[PDB]
């Protein structure tokens, strides 16, 4: 308890956010965190000319992370359903599923192994882990004997874990508000007190794989469909072209009257070049509208043919509803909280996450819309006396948010609280 | 199974659509054959008298010095004369091609006697052109199962060419490009071989005598000409490839007395290029790469020469595309996160390749790699930046060298699948 | 006591014993049974007795008469003597190599030697079944040649036990003689030297022939004769024959012999007896002619030659036989160059290889004390080749085979023997048996 | 007609210079008279009225014994006592000889009657010689014209005397050495006559009576040696052949008492040889052979001899060419491809070589044919070696034998004609 120096946690706090497709993780030290991609590769569906030419200690292990390593074999797997295991699929990872939990393990082991012991007065890590706010009570369970396992291949000291949206308050030095996480499997709006207000929740079928989704189907009616069938080329599409609109009406026909200013070009390789054509130039609108409102006659059309998936999900307690747009999700969290509260948290709307990282292209602020403002004129016509006094911002770099906010939360939590199942916050050493 | 044995007694055998390349792996170069049988069905009795009783026995004999002793009386050369991998396949309903091939794959393990007295069978891979279908496999598969009952050979396996390039290459992604014969096939690879990727060309050495062919009776050597054999020892000696056809065209009509030239066919017969045709030689070499200029059209327009297309069972011969678009062909219908690393590789392999530069012409004649490097600089300048572009050291024989390497790597607790396309089986 | 073997006739102990040989050369028949040491020679001629006075008609035996011809080399000798003119009734049915088919005369002498032939060798065993006849004919002899040679052996059927015919061209006779399987033939006869390269078979678009053969050695030897003021001698085609196989010499260069024997003249001088009563002498001052007896054979572009064509004594030129144009002039050297382009390049390496001379033509030898100047048969072709293409003379062994008459009908009887008899004739495959 | 009749019915008659043989072929030998007729051109009243008026009303009379009876008491011998083929031939002017010639004809066929009654006339060969020109073959077949319509004769025919030789001794190639009194003519025989081979020499019999007529002049008989009779009576006893007359006469002049002799010309006188001239003995005999030497060019020299040239018909007759070199010039005369053997055979006929040795002589003297072999040894010994030369079985016989043989084998159908020269004539 001389490990409790401040000046040993200013060096030594680990954090790692287990985000639903990206874990983000390194020291306190760090100026951003390290990035890898939660999914994992099982190696025991590869054909034995592909075996033969893998380090052995590798095959033994039987499960490939690390996205340098995975993008080697990716190419050569028979069955990517079986072997590319995404263990956060949604936020959560059903617990009797001992592929995920191998993953996630695994995770957290390439994650320390980024990171060397070198002083010979380091101790220990202080890992602060940020796990989804949809995370039932197992997760939590399993995450800390994940950590305990890996005690013995690396000097951990004291392990922690917090909810995301916390991290993101945290992280803003946001007291009283609205937190908005997107995620690529699901946006969750929290209201903050000065912790999380679990009572408020309401979290959302739908984030940056919906807007994937739809980049993909309209690749296939452009004529693509040789390129759309393979997902990294889709994402890649999805974050060079697609805009939000102001509003999905006015800037449709605007696209329509003048296509050629909406047209573009994208550089996938030297030998692939992906056009948007005059006569495609609409949707654009249509990949960043998703995520933010799915209820559109053009969307509905894409559901009615089996290509195009909005609906809900159940993980334990929570409902996550499909359809239910941003606006309406902010104003049914802060209608779940207290009446005398209602006034202060509302001031305050922060939105966090790579899901609402859209940028606007230089001479088009007219039909194209930023996040916050896609956010507020949603809130004008929803709740227009709720708007008014709002003030709605976007964080900084919205995919380390949540990192930031677990090393400070894992420098400040005091060591001499212990974790409490019941309480649901402390320490844990092994 | 001891690893002191397999670095012994592992036998590579290549069937190219020309050249069979054979021997262990204990050897410096593999031997070599040409893929063809002679039948002597339709021999007079008065050459078929003069033939050992035990060899006529078998109707066939294989080989290039016994199929040169008995070729010269030989009534109809096209009958009796079967080159079994014409371009790269076998049809399965060819009784004859199949003799051939297995009558090779004997010749092949005859080379070799059982010397040690521990020896106790073979370990044997084949490496079949990447066109070669489910039947082919197993057809070879069969002829050495039978010929087991004749030769100890303890386990087989058989793979695709391109990739043994790869091995013996020892990359892991990239772009073989093998020209042969019959056709140049570009195949990318992985880790194993990109099925998706592979494009075909019907183009290859033949063509390329082709055009030396019809050439060699301009200039009025229609004799010559006739013969197969000569036209193959010219397109050798004479042909060149240009940096740039028509540029290298001007370049030798303004000083024909540098590209004229004469080859020594036999002691008594020797053929000249004269100085009006000295600009033809750069026709020779540039067919290969590039069919698509006036001066070959005239040719196909007449009846007497032929670029077409191919389909053998799934794959399309493309006969008129260039091999600067082929690799960007190839490169398309591969994954697109990994065309980055597969095209920073390509391998050039086979014969129709091993062109090189006659000292004092590096003007205007351009070896394989670079008339590869500058046929990409015009068709994508953003890819030729990226891409690094070698021809092997030994064009034919780097086919073999891998399959030495591959059927020693292999673990023989693996057996093969007709799912799984991989694995070894044992007669 | 066995039955005879109903199988006998096939039996190698069978045809080890009467397979039969005959070449019919254009100016000698060689014959016999494989038994033989070497074959019994006979002319090919035939002496027709028609035009005779009745003081040698009547001691004459009847039923020679009643022929009204005879072959036969002592038998012709007899009578020949006393026939009144030797132009009409002397017929050489082969007079360069085939005989036409509209000569009614030729084909009657042919048979009567097919005859004559067989006649000589006659039916001693019990289990003779009849003979295994094999045939050479020269390389020019065309189809109907083939047709009338085997009508004339069928129709002697009903004369002789003759079981199968077979007739095989003479340069592949000479090739099967020598066991050489690839080579370049040349044939040198009377009327014709012809060069055939031989693969496993003849190779037909390969052969050359020359116009020119034994029979322009004699021509030469003739005028050179009535130069030296022998010419009631020069007249008699017997003696011109003797003289030339004497006399003649092969140059290694015709013109540095021909120096050679002008300032040391004694050194070449010759004497020939011709008969109890006659002697030639090649004089002093014509004694370098010698030369150009051989070396016409070879070379009849001289200018000492081209004299005796220039008067109208002597005639080199070009014949058609059929298909093929006997080339008067081109040289041996020369006329193999041209064999060889007509041959197929991946071979033209081995067929070169061996060079055979067969035929009497060749059968030139150097008279010891002579080599300086004088040259036998091969070392004149092979100064030839170096001459003519030098890449060529290094890579190829030429020599004459031992009895250049005698090696055609050996390869006969090996090819006869050899042949099964299971295998019949066909018009097309130009190769088999017929039975009569 | 019939084969059986010409074994009885064929009639021979050799003309000879100096002896008609003549007689049917049933004969063992012929019957002979002398070629000469007595003309009794005229005697006296005493003499005329004493002789049958029968036999002076012809004014001629043939046959020895004849000839005899009147000769005694006829005027002038020289004149009347006519040779008609005195020298082969009888001039055509000649109206005597010819007369004497049809009287043998007649006294030759009056010797044999007509016995048979199935007798249909003779069948009669003529051998006449070989320089018997045109005019003497027509007159001879006139002469049997005539003397048709005396005697029954129904076919005549005429051949050359050394074919009939020939015939008779069965020689198919042969040289035939005719040795006649006024000249000897060397034929060589292929199958029949060589026309352009014949050499004929001015020589013979009439030489060696010159020589003997010339030595009895100088041994002083002069009375007896102009007496012809006489000097032949001499000439037949005493006459020797030297092996060579250098060597032969050194014998006789060193050993004269050896070489002396004596002869009876009739009851009444007797002649005798004198030891100074019995060397000469040997001239007589060598003249016929070679007369070529100084001892004989003596008598030459002074106008006692003549050995001089002469031509019958388109013959020359060699007066000085040795019998040697007459052998050699007819072999040269002929084919080279049958000079072989056609000199393989020297067969000597006639009265000129009928020479003996006088036992115990045997050393300087030498018969006919020795002489012939020692003289073609000098002059071509390559000849020698090769020939063999004999005299015939009768030396007078021999010509009859062959015509008879002749007229028997000649068929009768076969008509005489004056290009051809041969077959028979009908009157
Ligand atoms: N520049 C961008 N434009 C649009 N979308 C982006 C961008 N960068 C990231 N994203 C999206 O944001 C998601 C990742 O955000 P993150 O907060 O890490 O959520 P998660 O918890 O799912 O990893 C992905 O679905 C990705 O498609
Ligand atoms: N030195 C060379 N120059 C040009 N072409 C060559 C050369 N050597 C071989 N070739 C060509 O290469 C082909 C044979 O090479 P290989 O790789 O064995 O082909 P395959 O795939 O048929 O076995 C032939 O068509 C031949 O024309
Ligand atoms: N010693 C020799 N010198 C030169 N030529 C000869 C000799 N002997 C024979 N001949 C020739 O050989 C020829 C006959 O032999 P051959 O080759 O069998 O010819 P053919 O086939 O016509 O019978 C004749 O032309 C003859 O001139
Ligand atoms: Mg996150």
Redesign the interface.
Same mark, same amino acid.
Request: glycine letters at 0%; aromatic letters at 10%.
């Given at each position: 308890m001389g490990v409790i120096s401040d000046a040993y946690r200013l060096k030594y706090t680990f954090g790692v956010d287990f985000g639903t497709s990206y874990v983000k993780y390194g020291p306190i030290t760090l100026n951003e965190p390290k990035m890898v991609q939660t999914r994992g590769l099982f190696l025991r569906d590869l054909? +034995? $000319? &592909?075996k033969? *030419?893998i380090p052995p200690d590798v095959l033994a292990r039987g499960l490939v992370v690390g996205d340098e390593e995975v *993008?080697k @074999? /990716?190419? $050569?797997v028979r069955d990517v359903q079986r072997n590319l295991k995404y263990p956060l699929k949604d936020g959560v990872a059903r617990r009797d599923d001992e592929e995920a939990w191998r993953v996630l393990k695994e995770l957290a082991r390439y994650t320390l192994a980024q990171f060397p012991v070198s002083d010979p007065e380091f101790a220990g890590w202080l890992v602060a882990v940020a796990l989804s706010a949809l995370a039932p009570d197992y997760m939590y369970k399993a995450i800390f004997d994940i950590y305990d396992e890996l005690a013995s291949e690396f000097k951990i000291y004291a392990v922690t874990i917090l909810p995301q949206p916390l991290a993101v308050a945290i992280a803003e030095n946001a007291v009283n508000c609205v937190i908005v996480e997107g995620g690529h499997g699901n946006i969750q709006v929290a209201p903050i007190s000065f912790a999380l207000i679990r009572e408020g929740l309401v979290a959302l079928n739908r984030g940056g794989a919906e807007a994937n989704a739809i980049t993909r189907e309209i690749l296939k009616d452009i004529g693509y469909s040789d390129?759309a069938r +393979?997902e @990294?080329?889709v994402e %890649?599409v999805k974050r060079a072209v697609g805009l939000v609109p102001r509003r999905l009406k006015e800037a449709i026909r605007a696209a329509k009257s003048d296509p050629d200013r909406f047209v573009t070009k994208v550089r /996938? $390789?030297? %030998? &692939?070049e992906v056009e948007i054509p005059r006569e495609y130039a609409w949707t654009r609108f249509l990949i960043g509208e998703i995520v933010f409102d799915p209820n559109h006659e053009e969307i509905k059309s894409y559901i009615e043919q089996s290509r195009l998936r909005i609906e809900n999900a159940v993980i334990g307690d929570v409902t996550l509803y499909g359809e239910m747009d941003v606006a309406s999700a902010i104003i049914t969290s802060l209608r779940n909280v207290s009446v005398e509260i209602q006034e202060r948290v509302a001031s305050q709307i922060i939105l966090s996450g790579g899901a609402f990282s859209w940028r606007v292209p230089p001479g088009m602020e007219d039909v194209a819309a930023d996040s916050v403002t896609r956010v507020k004129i949603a809130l004008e016509e929803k709740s227009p006396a709720l708007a008014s006094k709002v003030e709605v911002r976007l964080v900084s770099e919205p995919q380390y948010s949540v990192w930031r906010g677990a090393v400070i939360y894992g420098y400040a939590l005091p060591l001499s609280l212990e974790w409490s199942d019941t309480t649901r916050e402390g320490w844990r050493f092994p």
């Open positions: 054909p +034995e $000319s &592909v033969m *030419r *993008r @074999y /990716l190419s $050569s390129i +393979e @990294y080329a %890649v /996938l $390789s030297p %030998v &692939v």
